[PDB]
Write a protein that binds this ligand. Structure first.
Ligand SMILES: O=C(O)c1ccc[n+]([C@@H]2O[C@H](COP(=O)([O-])O)[C@@H](O)[C@H]2O)c1
Ligand SMILES: O=C(O)c1ccc[n+]([C@@H]2O[C@H](COP(=O)([O-])O)[C@@H](O)[C@H]2O)c1
Ligand SMILES: O=C(O)c1ccc[n+]([C@@H]2O[C@H](COP(=O)([O-])O)[C@@H](O)[C@H]2O)c1
Ligand SMILES: O=C(O)c1ccc[n+]([C@@H]2O[C@H](COP(=O)([O-])O)[C@@H](O)[C@H]2O)c1
Lengths: 389, 389, 100, 389
């Protein structure tokens, strides 16, 4: 339909971004369509050995808005495990209405939550490792450009303090983050590149200088210390083959700077960073992190959507549990317990009462509240990430 | 800019889908821009323990067409390793021109080849395992819908005989593939669902019936054998928790059918399939495969783009090899050898002569040939996949 | 099933083997809404159908409670071990037939 | 019923050695009994990563003789894998008749083949490792005495040249094997014990002297060499805690004997022997082996018996393949292929023709041939063990 190999928002809204057997089956159903009301629930088949930071539901609402459907879901930014206290699959969203009215959208709805959720969950992990130190989403270049804005949104909501993509920055309503590339230094030499970068950085923003382009990080650090003065960060993006012991290198640089009484210069690292990498380099002395691929490429959660009830009667296939359900959670020990939809709360001297986490976002196609902006959502997940060490 | 969290083709064409430090650095360069001609080469830092089936270059050409740049690259569908006979990084594409003229596109260019390449490479692996048996791309639902068309294109070029997505089908100029979903059987019961599916399938296409919704695959298979007649395939999408030994189950079904002299009914499997899974189930008796997540979620190759020459002089950073280069390959023992761009061919009694694999696709922004359609490209990769067992 | 029930007397609990033809889940529903005095339901799931015996057992227990028949207890058997027993018990199995 | 916790032959013949639910179910069936003819086949669920040397069928015939049943089976001593060329379970015996007529015997029939088969299969393994060297079944003391005769029978049929048990010896029609115990040496001292043993050994039999009771095997070996003359074997049953390197010790002894030109004295080992142990000690110089626990305690094969057809119609449960079946094998490349009972032979240019391995041993309760004696059976398994390295 368009220039690149992508689906326009129109196309996806028309049911064009889907597996053909859906429209073909709806077509086969024909007249019976009018008489088939169902409730479908999305659950995680995917990785069960990890909690998840739910994200991407905003996209689902924009898609289903208008159809005569009811939509329940766990708010984005909520963190929990895929199975509850008793090993039951936790339903993340429930859709109700005439099957033929939205059935062709299964592909898109899953797509909206699988990939986004893996991203935000990976970012929350990095968030835990980075501690008080700032980290940024630097990985849109590893994924197809068309989805670069949602990648940065999920990395942000997941915990990133900032983002490098222009469009994602816009979406989360923050200024894009950026330092200087090796290119500048390869074209103009270090000195010229460093001077230019400093002359071009204004208040409100910190100075960052890339130093591993030509020299050894240690001598490049000395040269900068005794050449400039207003340099906030020094960034090391050490080539893989020079990374014998990145931690030892970072200690060496910090020592060499303090010796010259320039321990005011902070260190930022980037390049093939991970939560493990981040934790180690931080204990080594790195105070800022540029994290890309590990986050932008997070494996998606394997969400599945199934009809759990038909025309009021619980009905499913082998492997699924039938009936509409709610997701209750203790107001205290954040314990979960999936229950039949006719149960709204449950007591538990363990920690007060258990209240439903599901929330109605659409009623007959209409929104039931104003949707939170990214900042509000990541403010929620940071509070929720609290209960996870 | 648009409804969903995506970048429109306009946005990406405007340099909007990128890391801000690129435009910011180009901006800083200012007047010097006119005097900075560079050649940048994309190489695989990514997985080195595997060959790659290069895909996504078509998207790169549509992006760079118009800029006053020269573009060299390895044609899509070429299969090779990231390092050559002597462990040197193989350059997959080279761009030449004023740095400020395209420098902001680094993010998009990488995005176009990293993710697509992982997909097509994973599909070639499945292609090797499926043997003569047909397999289809069934995984767009795991990834964001906006990029569903490129996913199916790469799975196709990589070896898939067919694809389930509507838009991807259109792009590769083939009819979308589809069978029947559990939903149909959950709403109308098996019998009704099976009868409907058969009545709704026309010549040119084979009949496929999903059987694991309510019954045990074995008894559902008997019931179908002695109930219908014109049923080409039987599809098993056995729930994970019922998959004690999927291979043994498949043998059991095949035996039970032959006993009733209905070995004409073929078996198709789907659900969490892998190349290993595919190889085993095929040795077990499965004759068709629906492969999703393992392919749609393939890890991306970690491509990196660097300035390798400036205003005619070889120049790079630590970790990269400078100078423009060519990629020569033996016409026989498909051996590779990266060399300086002033070397077009090399002899080698090992197998004739070594000829350059790089091909000029853009000259001063103009195409230098008509771009191949998906069918032509996968016809190339199947020939190339020949030299790989 | 009818024969087994008619043939079981007081002092002893009723036990019905359910995995012979149907999927344990649907066989469990069918029994719940067909009988009433069935103490135990026994699953001797064939090895090749045992993808995740624990998950299957949870599925059955849920499907029964939904129909308010959580009074029906579950017994497992077939290639059981102390490890197997500990896991299936945490899964919801209340009786075990342990052989080999 | 008797002194010890055993089932008399009467008890087992009466259906007393069984799981109660069998008679209880037959009882429940009542009048329908007259109308329920079935065919049940025994298959190996058990270890599938190994071939099996089938044994114990003789016991099954003595149990079923008289009942109006037909019995097919693979002859004892046949060696093969549990699954055929295509991964299908191989049926080892088939019983046909009124279910109520023998159904209570399932427990006993399985018991007769599971444990015996593990024993004979383990012995064939030791047989392969022992090579040309003789080994004996020495393990009845680890198992309940009541079944000591069947243990030695299976170890013999499996490959043992001799057996230590009195009753088992009788059953295989051979003289029991025996050397001298530590007791004799603990009560009378070595010299007296050795002299007594020699004075008490007659022609036809070799002399064997236990030497590790008091001295170091090396010095005890010297002492014997220069004290006696007609000593055929020297037996080392070195205590576990003295077995630092049993192989090195054995080499040391052999050297010390040859030095004194007494390499005519052969060495026999015993104590915690295995096929691996046997292979190593044999390469070390041991020429005879006393093998116990590893054989007498062999894990049983997990045989299962199921109704595969009812009143002429193929019928089974999930997990089993229905219908009566035959087991065909190539007269050459000893390949197997289970097929429907209406197939007696199959061609295969691979190696002549495939002929049925199943053999009718009972017809209406009557034997259809004279049953082979143990010697004939192990003569068969040694020929069959040929095709296994
Ligand atoms: O400097 C920036 O603002 C910047 C923004 C986005 C990505 N990057 C670069 O891309 C690399 C990190 O991506 P990755 O996948 O190796 O983690 C690292 O070498 C950075 O120099 C750099
Ligand atoms: O039937 C189709 O045409 C079809 C097209 C695309 C995806 N699917 C389904 O999605 C599942 C396979 O995706 P996956 O990631 O588990 O490999 C499998 O259970 C199929 O039933 C099915
Ligand atoms: O139901 C009984 O009373 C019964 C008594 C003894 C043994 N069994 C069966 O034998 C199997 C268990 O033995 P095992 O070695 O697999 O643990 C299991 O499938 C049961 O159905 C069953
Ligand atoms: O000497 C015999 O005739 C003899 C007959 C049967 C068993 N044994 C002994 O029992 C031991 C071997 O049994 P095992 O289970 O350790 O292999 C070994 O120490 C022998 O001395 C010895």
């Amino acid at each position: 339909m368009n220039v690149f190999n992508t689906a326009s928002d129109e196309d996806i809204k028309k049911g064009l971004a889907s597996d053909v057997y859906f429209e073909r089956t709806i077509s086969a159903i024909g007249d019976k369509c009018n008489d088939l009301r169902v409730a479908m629930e999305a659950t995680v088949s995917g990785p069960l050995d990890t909690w998840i930071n739910f994200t991407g539901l905003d996209e689902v609402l924009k898609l289903l808005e208008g159809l005569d459907v009811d939509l329940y879901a766990i708010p984005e930014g909520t963190i929990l495990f895929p199975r509850d206290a008793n090993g039951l699959p936790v339903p993340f969203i429930r859709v109700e209405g005439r099957y033929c009215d939205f059935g062709m959208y299964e592909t898109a709805i899953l797509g909206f939550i699988c990939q986004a959720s893996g991203i935000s969950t990976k970012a929350s992990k990095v968030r835990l490792a980075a501690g008080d130190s700032p980290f940024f989403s630097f990985g849109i270049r590893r994924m197809h450009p068309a989805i670069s804005p949602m990648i940065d949104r999920s990395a942000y909501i997941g915990g990133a303090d900032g983002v490098s993509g222009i469009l994602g920055a816009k979406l989360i309503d923050q200024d894009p983050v950026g330092t200087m590339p090796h290119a500048l230094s390869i074209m103009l030499g270090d000195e010229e590149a460093w001077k230019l970068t400093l002359e071009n950085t204004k208040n409100g923003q910190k100075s960052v200088l890339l130093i591993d382009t030509y020299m050894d990080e240690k001598f490049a650090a000395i040269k900068i210390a005794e050449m400039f003065d207003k340099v906030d960060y020094i960034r090391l993006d050490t080539p893989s083959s020079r990374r014998g012991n990145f931690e030892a290198l970072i200690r060496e640089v910090r020592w060499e700077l303090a010796l010259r009484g320039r321990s005011d210069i902070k260190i930022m690292v980037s390049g093939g960073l991970d939560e493990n990498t981040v934790k180690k380099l931080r204990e080594a002395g790195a105070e800022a992190f540029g994290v890309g691929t590990s986050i932008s490429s997070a494996k998606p959660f394997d969400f599945a959507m199934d009809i759990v009830e038909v025309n009021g009667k619980p009905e499913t296939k082998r492997g699924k549990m039938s009936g509409r359900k709610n997701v209750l959670r203790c107001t205290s020990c954040h314990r979960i317990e999936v229950v039949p939809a006719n149960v709204q709360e449950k007591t538990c001297i363990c920690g007060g009462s258990m209240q439903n986490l599901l929330v109605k976002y659409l009623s007959h196609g209409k929104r039931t509240s104003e949707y939170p902006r990214p900042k509000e959502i990541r403010s929620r997940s940071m509070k929720e990430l609290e209960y996870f060490k």
